[PDB]
Amino acid sequence: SMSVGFIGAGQLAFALAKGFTAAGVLAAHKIMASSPDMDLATVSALRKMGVKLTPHNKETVQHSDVLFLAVKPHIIPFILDEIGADIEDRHIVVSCAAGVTISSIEKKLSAFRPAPRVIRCMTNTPVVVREGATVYATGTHAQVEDGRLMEQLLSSVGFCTEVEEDLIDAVTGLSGSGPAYAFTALDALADGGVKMGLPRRLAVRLGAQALLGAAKMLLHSEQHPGQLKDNVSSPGGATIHALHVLESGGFRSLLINAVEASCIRTRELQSMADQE
Amino acid sequence: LYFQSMSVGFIGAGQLAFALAKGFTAAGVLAAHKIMASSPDMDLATVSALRKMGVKLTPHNKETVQHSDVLFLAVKPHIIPFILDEIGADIEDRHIVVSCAAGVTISSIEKKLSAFRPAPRVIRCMTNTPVVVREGATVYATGTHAQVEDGRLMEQLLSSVGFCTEVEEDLIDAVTGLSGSGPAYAFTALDALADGGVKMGLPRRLAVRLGAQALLGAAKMLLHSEQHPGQLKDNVSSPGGATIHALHVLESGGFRSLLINAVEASCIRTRELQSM
Amino acid sequence: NLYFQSMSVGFIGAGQLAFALAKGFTAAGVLAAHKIMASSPDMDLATVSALRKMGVKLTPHNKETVQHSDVLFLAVKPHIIPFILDEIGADIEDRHIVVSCAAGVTISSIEKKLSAFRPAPRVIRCMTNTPVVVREGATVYATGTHAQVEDGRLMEQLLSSVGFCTEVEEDLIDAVTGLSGSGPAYAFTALDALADGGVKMGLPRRLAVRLGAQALLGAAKMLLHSEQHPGQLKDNVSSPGGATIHALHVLESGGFRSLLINAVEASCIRTRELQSMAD
Amino acid sequence: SMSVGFIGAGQLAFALAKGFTAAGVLAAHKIMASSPDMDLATVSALRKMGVKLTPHNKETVQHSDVLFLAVKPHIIPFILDEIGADIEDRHIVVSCAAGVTISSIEKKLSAFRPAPRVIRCMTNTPVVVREGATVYATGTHAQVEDGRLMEQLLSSVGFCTEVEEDLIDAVTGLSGSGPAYAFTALDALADGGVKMGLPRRLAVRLGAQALLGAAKMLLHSEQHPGQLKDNVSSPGGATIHALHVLESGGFRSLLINAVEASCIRTRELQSM
Ligand SMILES: NC(=O)c1ccc[n+]([C@@H]2O[C@H](COP(=O)([O-])OP(=O)(O)OC[C@H]3O[C@@H](n4cnc5c(N)ncnc54)[C@H](O)[C@@H]3O)[C@@H](O)[C@H]2O)c1
Ligand SMILES: NC(=O)c1ccc[n+]([C@@H]2O[C@H](COP(=O)([O-])OP(=O)(O)OC[C@H]3O[C@@H](n4cnc5c(N)ncnc54)[C@H](O)[C@@H]3O)[C@@H](O)[C@H]2O)c1
Ligand SMILES: NC(=O)c1ccc[n+]([C@@H]2O[C@H](COP(=O)([O-])OP(=O)(O)OC[C@H]3O[C@@H](n4cnc5c(N)ncnc54)[C@H](O)[C@@H]3O)[C@@H](O)[C@H]2O)c1
Ligand SMILES: NC(=O)c1ccc[n+]([C@@H]2O[C@H](COP(=O)([O-])OP(=O)(O)OC[C@H]3O[C@@H](n4cnc5c(N)ncnc54)[C@H](O)[C@@H]3O)[C@@H](O)[C@H]2O)c1
């Protein structure tokens, strides 16, 4: 029942706006988004939603109480310089950008007005179906109710928890990049279904249902994923035969490699940002 | 009206019998006491879980057959002919026999039971453990003498606990490799993703939660999207970014091939289980 | 406080397994060594010398072991089983319980040979392992057609004195052979390698061996006394960002898990193939 | 008589607390553990045991005679700053942290009182079943009886020996991380049994028993682990066939790689 803004009108702005309005926590008309190119396909999607669109980032700031920064990490410093003087006492600035530290944001903004209210989050694209995974850290001058408000809002579109900021790059490598790992696994599983004689449409549907179902089981269980895996693996059966071939390929190591590589690239990019 | 006075039985009181019983009762489809399950060893952890559920248990498969309208065969494939010999003379015209056993053909079951009575009503099914959270993936094929309402009853019953669709029987071995074994692939992946989070500094509990939420959310997005998995992948993969870096390391280990390998190995083993 | 005062035990074969079991039983106090007899055609083996020092009766003649024994262990190589059954089949009596320890050899095949001489041989098949020598064996057994219920009970009592023991269906025994029968060799290989790792990083070999073996022993005991999944116990060792999780990743990268699955499979398959050639 | 404290109330504090009380060396109520998060599973487990719990590390220090530092390496200098002024002459400070040097600990504590008694330790979680593998090195001001007391205490929960401090990073890689390698191996061995037709519960029991028995054999034998392997490996048989497939995957190299990777990471944990 408050005004929300997005600097950037891309994949994430759309996913979050769609999630929030689907959840009934925000009205489309109370959301404004800005982008230099008002022609992107995400901008058309946001427009069909009933979100207000403008090329001017200063309008989005003036409209908003909660302001999401939804631009690529290297654009963050530029927009902070652009609208730093327009930030007001009322604003909660929520950065969604991978890698970008609360300290870097607070430093740019504090030049214009002291005590900016800053929250850093990492979320993912499934907020669009209200099954996101979101973490946030509160800044130096965030009020206690600011983190509570943020958890309330982001909980409407998935799992939300507060973390120490020093965990966010790792979360980025796991749940931020995680959907892409799943989409790749699902395409491959469907290819396997197809190789064994299934129609593609049926293979995609069953693969995706299998992954959704397994994930829900784990979330609702008190047991270790190893135990749930044990329960599927009948002695001498089809499943244990398949698990062996995954093991022989170092399947588990690949997913460990993936989380590590995404985390390291996130950290590495911010080092370049900090040096620059 | 299908579930109004239906009695269900399970030959086998193991992981699948428990999973389906928990799902059916959670769904509100059947009262727990309207379900019976039988096993030689009544001291398994699965028999104990079923007992606390309120499900009637007995060591005698004949008693399960007499109680049941719909009779689920939930034993290892090599035990199916043994129990068909045992209780085949007790299978009346009224029974719908639902084989959940990997690989075991409708033909083989009908050949056995037809020696006792001429028109045994036989359905073959492949399902998975996530029926326990009503997010299963189920296929069924109807036998020679299954009536039109038998398939509708089966679709209604198995749709209460997740996805369900009728298929040609010749797809079922493939489905086994994809969605039957699928949850085990997911559990392995989630354990490995959590290990990745942990290597990069996340507490285990948070890493498990975030990984599972990421998979669940991505699966949901795919099911609700009109777009190809590769396109959804592209929406997460920012140029030069963390995610595309992680995807490369997955590609470098042949991640996709491993999942194809798994679906294939499970399907091939299911085919061997029937020959043997 | 167990002791079989009326039980005479014999081993046909005086090798690694006969020594391991005799040593375990006598350490357990359930049998006096002079109530044990073992036979082998080679009476100049280290295992024969070790049995002699221990107080076990030795003879070259298998018929003497049979005549001494109530419980008769067949502790010869699988391919030697048919020969010794032909040799002593006519000497089997009502009182004998024949306990085959041979890898792969079916109750069926043993019962078929002995039944030619005298019907209703009481036969039990077991799979054990060398750690019975320190009373920490892993033993399974299956009862034959003519085995009394008191026969299985007695054998479990005896074999439980030297480690874990449980009854199984005979069709699981080749797989047990691949896991717990061959298992100690997998462990000895792992301990040698872990010690080499300790030495590479600067430890004296003796300390490296002690610490590695203690780590494995302790971990195994933890799992046995825990209600938690081995994955959960692993998780508790693995501090975020820490040493352990880094080492686990390099294990995963080499397909460590697959290798152990490969080993159990290969040992089980070889066990089945050898019998298939025998039969 | 002895009061024991843990700064940190996580996996290690729980394991050691469980071991010591199971050994009958300490009454649970003579142990106090502290943690800023009192809503952890480990804290609840310690609470059920009868261990005293507090969010205040100073309370743990004042309670304790032997004070175990059971926090992550990077937290160590923070808590040394915090409670350094509360360290008394009676205290033996026992650091269990991976990689953290006696030198670094004495440097911090020596700013407050001149002769802090510091012991560095590496142990492992099987202390919970009194079969831990523990090593320790004594600091500059640790008396001979401090080392003896520590050996008596840690020997009640498993193997314990004194080493030179320069060996501890390598021990961390072997016995510190070792139980996790064993749990991985046991899970995989059980998967193998299940593949070949065994029930999971039986496969887990048998695999664990096989490992326990084999380890015990080696500890009670004067023979090389290669010779013990030979005694299981009949010519042409099942075991030698399985050993070949292990060799073909470079099984031994993987375990060497693991010990090295843990030791090297332990050395990095300190350097930064
Ligand atoms: N897509 C994901 O999976 C995901 C998930 C979590 C977090 N994020 C984070 O969200 C941020 C944006 O990601 P995305 O995928 O939506 O980016 P993307 O390119 O879709 O969208 C970026 C938007 O920023 C706009 N933009 C460029 N310059 C601008 C400026 N000066 N002022 C205002 N807008 C400008 C672009 O026109 C575009 O509309 C990144 O920092 C990323 O780390 C992305
Ligand atoms: N677990 C899964 O993920 C899953 C999913 C779909 C289908 N299935 C199929 O279900 C079947 C059962 O698998 P599970 O995982 O439940 O096996 P699991 O080992 O529980 O065993 C099932 C039950 O069969 C019982 N049984 C053995 N002999 C019997 C007899 N003579 N009479 C009655 N009961 C007997 C066992 O005692 C046990 O209670 C298999 O054919 C499998 O392919 C399993
Ligand atoms: N060693 C293990 O790890 C182990 C574990 C479990 C089961 N087993 C089984 O135990 C059996 C023996 O194994 P082992 O390791 O003790 O063998 P090994 O060679 O040490 O001993 C074999 C013994 O049989 C004797 N022998 C040969 N021909 C004979 C004959 N005609 N009559 C009597 N004795 C004869 C040999 O002289 C020797 O004393 C095998 O079937 C093996 O599968 C071995
Ligand atoms: N887990 C093992 O297998 C093992 C074995 C030997 C040594 N260690 C060492 O023990 C140390 C702790 O490992 P763990 O696995 O028990 O850690 P883990 O996180 O379970 O527990 C650490 C504990 O420290 C607490 N803590 C954090 N900050 C604190 C502070 N400022 N004051 C007091 N307590 C604080 C945490 O809340 C938690 O209770 C590490 O240095 C590790 O190298 C672990």
mmCIF file of C-alpha atoms in Angstrom, chain A residues 224 226-227 230 244 247-248 250 252-253 256-257 260, chain C residues 229 231-232 235 249 252-253 255 257-258 261-262 265:
data_model
loop_
_atom_site.group_PDB
_atom_site.id
_atom_site.type_symbol
_atom_site.label_atom_id
_atom_site.label_comp_id
_atom_site.label_asym_id
_atom_site.label_seq_id
_atom_site.Cartn_x
_atom_site.Cartn_y
_atom_site.Cartn_z
ATOM 1 C CA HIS A 224 18.876 -35.611 4.775
ATOM 2 C CA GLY A 226 20.885 -38.766 1.091
ATOM 3 C CA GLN A 227 18.136 -40.546 3.019
ATOM 4 C CA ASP A 230 18.079 -43.973 -0.348
ATOM 5 C CA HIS A 244 26.070 -45.095 -10.609
ATOM 6 C CA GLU A 247 28.670 -40.885 -10.015
ATOM 7 C CA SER A 248 31.021 -42.237 -12.679
ATOM 8 C CA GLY A 250 31.570 -36.874 -11.232
ATOM 9 C CA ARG A 252 28.282 -33.991 -7.816
ATOM 10 C CA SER A 253 31.676 -32.362 -8.472
ATOM 11 C CA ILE A 256 30.139 -27.952 -6.733
ATOM 12 C CA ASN A 257 32.291 -26.466 -9.561
ATOM 13 C CA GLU A 260 32.172 -22.063 -6.896
ATOM 14 C CA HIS C 229 22.601 -40.695 7.679
ATOM 15 C CA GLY C 231 25.665 -37.660 4.778
ATOM 16 C CA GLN C 232 24.634 -35.885 7.991
ATOM 17 C CA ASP C 235 28.034 -32.406 7.072
ATOM 18 C CA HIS C 249 35.584 -31.576 -3.497
ATOM 19 C CA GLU C 252 34.232 -35.792 -5.838
ATOM 20 C CA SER C 253 36.207 -34.485 -8.799
ATOM 21 C CA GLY C 255 34.636 -39.842 -8.897
ATOM 22 C CA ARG C 257 32.160 -42.640 -4.837
ATOM 23 C CA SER C 258 31.902 -44.350 -8.236
ATOM 24 C CA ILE C 261 30.587 -48.721 -6.160
ATOM 25 C CA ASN C 262 32.715 -50.183 -9.006
ATOM 26 C CA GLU C 265 30.136 -54.569 -8.211
#
